[PDB]
Design a protein around this ligand. Sequence first.
Ligand SMILES: NC[C@@H]1O[C@H](O[C@H]2[C@@H](O)[C@H](O[C@@H]3[C@@H](O)[C@H](N)C[C@H](N)[C@H]3O[C@H]3O[C@H](CN)[C@@H](O)[C@H](O)[C@H]3N)O[C@@H]2CO)[C@H](N)[C@@H](O)[C@@H]1O
Ligand SMILES: NC[C@@H]1O[C@H](O[C@H]2[C@@H](O)[C@H](O[C@@H]3[C@@H](O)[C@H](N)C[C@H](N)[C@H]3O[C@H]3O[C@H](CN)[C@@H](O)[C@H](O)[C@H]3N)O[C@@H]2CO)[C@H](N)[C@@H](O)[C@@H]1O
Ligand SMILES: [Ca+2]
Ligand SMILES: [Mg+2]
Ligand SMILES: [Mg+2]
Lengths: 253, 252
Amino acid sequence: MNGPIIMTREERMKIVHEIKERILDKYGDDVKAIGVYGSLGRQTDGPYSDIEMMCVMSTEEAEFSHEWTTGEWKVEVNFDSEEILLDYASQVESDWPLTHGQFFSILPIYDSGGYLEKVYQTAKSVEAQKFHDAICALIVEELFEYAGKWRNIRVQGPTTFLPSLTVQVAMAGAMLIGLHHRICYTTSASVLTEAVKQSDLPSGYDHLCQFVMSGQLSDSEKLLESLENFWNGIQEWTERHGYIVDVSKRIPF
Amino acid sequence: NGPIIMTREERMKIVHEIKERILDKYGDDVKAIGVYGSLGRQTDGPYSDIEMMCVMSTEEAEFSHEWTTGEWKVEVNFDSEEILLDYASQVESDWPLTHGQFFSILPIYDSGGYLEKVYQTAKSVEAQKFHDAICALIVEELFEYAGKWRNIRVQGPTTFLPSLTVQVAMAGAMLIGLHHRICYTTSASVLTEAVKQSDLPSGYDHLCQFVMSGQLSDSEKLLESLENFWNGIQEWTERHGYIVDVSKRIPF
Ligand SMILES: NC[C@@H]1O[C@H](O[C@H]2[C@@H](O)[C@H](O[C@@H]3[C@@H](O)[C@H](N)C[C@H](N)[C@H]3O[C@H]3O[C@H](CN)[C@@H](O)[C@H](O)[C@H]3N)O[C@@H]2CO)[C@H](N)[C@@H](O)[C@@H]1O
Ligand SMILES: NC[C@@H]1O[C@H](O[C@H]2[C@@H](O)[C@H](O[C@@H]3[C@@H](O)[C@H](N)C[C@H](N)[C@H]3O[C@H]3O[C@H](CN)[C@@H](O)[C@H](O)[C@H]3N)O[C@@H]2CO)[C@H](N)[C@@H](O)[C@@H]1O
Ligand SMILES: [Ca+2]
Ligand SMILES: [Mg+2]
Ligand SMILES: [Mg+2]
């Protein structure tokens, strides 16, 4: 297994339509729609891309996937009932900016009743409260946790964790920015480059990303300073924008 | 401006206050309460958060309370026994990161040996599950990463390479942890513990040195090291019998 290998878009689409034929052969009238998502769905796949497809099923409670390799390429096909997919499309978790670009990258190749259009409309019409709640949760569940981890590093080590943690913090900052601006990053590789181009960044986030994007992560004192500055920028930014969590109670239940 | 420095004794006070609140609020529906994580192992440092698990009798109970006081952070998970036992016996790609919870339990209340039963379940998972998880990890994560850094080599962007290299090193540490059936103690010790194990795939220790030192700016050296680690994976998995099925063009 020396793959993945170089492939053309033409070769990838040939594979997509073979999979389409197998899906229709196997599930027949239970198939509501089939779409390609990811880079191939946007027709911006590069030489080494994977193949990602989604199938809307009529079967109640259908929720399964097939993910496999031939050693030279890899495919993931998800199968969901319409109800399960629409619910997923309207839930906003802390990694919504990483997961839900699926619904903005759909290339329908089969659709028996506007089903993929419905999916897109549901994904693009999520209410503002869900993004507000997800941002407040991200601050508590991830950012506050990371601050404790790098502050522990400052006092007791290990600095060998600091480069990885710094990457994690920059990624969480990109989720914060993506939820706030309601943007779904196009690829894994474009998360940080797209995050730092957005407007109204928390102070210190740009600088933190500069270390991560340059790969210059060996100066622990500079990183800890940049992390603290970003944590300060977070505090100012969330109160400016009203992402306020009541922290007054020792036990809030 | 938190989290702040706290002592182990201050954290244990908080834990017992939460225990009292849980028993007042839920009463006889509480089967057991435990602390896990660094505090459960009694190795918490100055800034650690507090993590607790409850076993509930209510069928389908599955919720959590996670909050900060501005100064410290707590997460309390509430699960039925059946939901928790099921979770404790499922082996995903990140089992070495997640299931140390079950080897870190400090019991503080237990009406019927429930925490011990959860621990026994977690420690007795079938070997085949780890095999399946490793084969899944190779396909679903490592093969994906290889395509991503090979795309970087030919079309950029190299600004993704340090973050991607960190991801690959972490995925290699999951592979090692699944193989040796070990749950890393903390986020921070994953890579130092992974590279101390025996039977490392070739190229893995070298790759991790870039990640641990933070020397992630030489893109050609990183790409060469990823390729060597990817080669090392192929020899290693074949040697240990983690054979990925590549025979089907469409496997359904
Ligand atoms: N509690 C047992 C089981 O937990 C599962 O969820 C697991 C996982 O998704 C979930 O992850 C939750 C998130 O969700 C939530 N949004 C933030 C929270 N900090 C995080 O917590 C988890 O991840 C952290 C690292 N990031 C760890 O530090 C932490 O100890 C761990 N409990 O925690 C669970 C593992 O502890 C299922 N809910 C269910 O099978 C069952 O209830
Ligand atoms: N399909 C719609 C919904 O997806 C959910 O799960 C989501 C998520 O956990 C799941 O993640 C799956 C994993 O599990 C599986 N073990 C490896 C697989 N490559 C991964 O795939 C996901 O993460 C990858 C990045 N590493 C992305 O490249 C990929 O596009 C994305 N589908 O993909 C789903 C997003 O597509 C639920 N299954 C369900 O609510 C519903 O089916
Ligand atoms: Ca025990
Ligand atoms: Mg946590
Ligand atoms: Mg994937």
